Design a binder for this molecule. Sequence first.
Ligand SMILES: OC[C@H]1O[C@@H](O[C@H]2[C@H](O)[C@@H](O)[C@H](O[C@H]3[C@H](O)[C@@H](O)[C@H](O[C@H]4[C@H](O)[C@@H](O)[C@H](O[C@H]5[C@H](O)[C@@H](O)[C@H](O)O[C@@H]5CO)O[C@@H]4CO)O[C@@H]3CO)O[C@@H]2CO)[C@H](O)[C@@H](O)[C@@H]1O
Length: 406
Amino acid sequence: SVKLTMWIMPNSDTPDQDLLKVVKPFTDANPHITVEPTVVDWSAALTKITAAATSGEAPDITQVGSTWTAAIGAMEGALVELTGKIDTSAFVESTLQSAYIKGTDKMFGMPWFTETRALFYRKDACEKAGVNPETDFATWDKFKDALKKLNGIEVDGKKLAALGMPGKNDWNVVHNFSWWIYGAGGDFVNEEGTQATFSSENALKGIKFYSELAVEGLMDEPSLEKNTSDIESAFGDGAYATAFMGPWVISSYTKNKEENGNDLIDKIGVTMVPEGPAGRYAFMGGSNLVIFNSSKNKDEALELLKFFASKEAQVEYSKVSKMLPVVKAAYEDPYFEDSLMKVFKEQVDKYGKHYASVPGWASAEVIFSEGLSKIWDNVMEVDGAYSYDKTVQIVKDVESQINQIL
Ligand SMILES: OC[C@H]1O[C@@H](O[C@H]2[C@H](O)[C@@H](O)[C@H](O[C@H]3[C@H](O)[C@@H](O)[C@H](O[C@H]4[C@H](O)[C@@H](O)[C@H](O[C@H]5[C@H](O)[C@@H](O)[C@H](O)O[C@@H]5CO)O[C@@H]4CO)O[C@@H]3CO)O[C@@H]2CO)[C@H](O)[C@@H](O)[C@@H]1O
């Protein structure tokens, strides 16, 4: 008897039991192997994974955020190197970038799922404001003009803010700036991933354009004090005409209808992020699976990773989590005929950009979270009138620290 233990982040409504249903055919086929998952929240996941990779008190397998895989893989003796042990030919090729440490051929993670952030909108709000969501969100400029028509629009008995986005207290602070920086023609690092570059003229233009949506009254200011979880539920309760969100919110909005009679899920559509002056770019995220080097059952752990990469396991976890499969053949399933999900798939395939997979990037994300949130403090005028020059100073200070980290 072999007991495999697994750490997962909260990818679905009931994470441990949802995972156990997906792995049931594996444990039915292998009666000598059991799978025991434990949930670790996103806020503590980096610290807990790092400590486990060093101390030795570790599960066999853990989920790792795709942007963290290089940081954990670069710790000596932390992870099993997976090169040659996983057959990558079945995978969407773009998903492998985060599985390797950049500048090396070393693969320490297996892609498990991907995600992107798309533009959710209220159909009833758009029709009341005279906004055509087929065309009026296509570019930055048209998107901004649509927000002006949507700001304060009354639908049913209440007025909606045009755009609702979080500002603080999770990893999504940098993720939500990423594609505005890309769309402006900027980037976070140079091609080598050795030097920070997000204080460039273009990167600041994207930061300026996005953050000043709130200065101009089009983004709900109180929501900038809150985290992603708070703003997703606010959108599901009808507070905003639009919001940029991951696909997982569809699970929660569907449940709200089944449990509370909340009809929000029937009133929304999704489109790709507006195109900026650089062309269209989108945040590309997701998670990998890794095997700890301290595992006493690496062969069985490898069999489980291969199962998670199988076509049907990819389809089933996508159905419950709404995350995107990383295996090409999963998209032959009729489920991916859904109009909402197809937008996330088309966006990430054509326009998804992932951060440089460098060891210092996980540490940099902690720095971004703090620093980019000060830009929202500036916009919200908690300490004096808003000044773009203060934003410039904040980004310059963040850039210097990340350069030391890199
Ligand atoms: O930078 C690191 C890493 O980030 C990845 O992106 C992450 C992102 O960091 C996370 O913030 C995000 O977390 C979301 C979860 O994926 C999603 O499952 C979760 O869904 C919640 C739901 O919001 C919540 O309502 C629900 O509570 C229910 C209860 O379970 C019931 O008991 C109760 O009665 O009713 C409620 C209603 O459903 O629970 C679920 C699960 O907890 O919401 C999170 C956002 O708030 O996930 C992103 C993707 O993983 C990025 O992809 C990586 O590349 C990167 O490395």
